[PDB]
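Appendix C. Worked example: Complement C5
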Amino acid sequence: HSVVKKCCYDGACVNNDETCEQRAARISLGPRCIKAFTECCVVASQLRANISRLHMKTLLPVSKPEIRSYFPESWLWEVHLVPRRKQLQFA
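Step 2, the predicted output written as structure tokens:
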């Protein structure tokens, strides 16, 4: 639950292309974290030659605000003086 717990995540992630130990060389933050990011990637890659299709990932802060769908500019946002009856038209 350390500020490091992230690295022991986005280090776990996939890399068909490149290997952990080199991957980590790229990481500006703390050697405090480099550790995490290394052991993690290392182990997920260990396991990546066994439960496979059919792995499956549990998560840490799975918390981002997203909405799949968009919503338009509303319209008919006007204010009117209405004399017992008034009627405006519009498409």
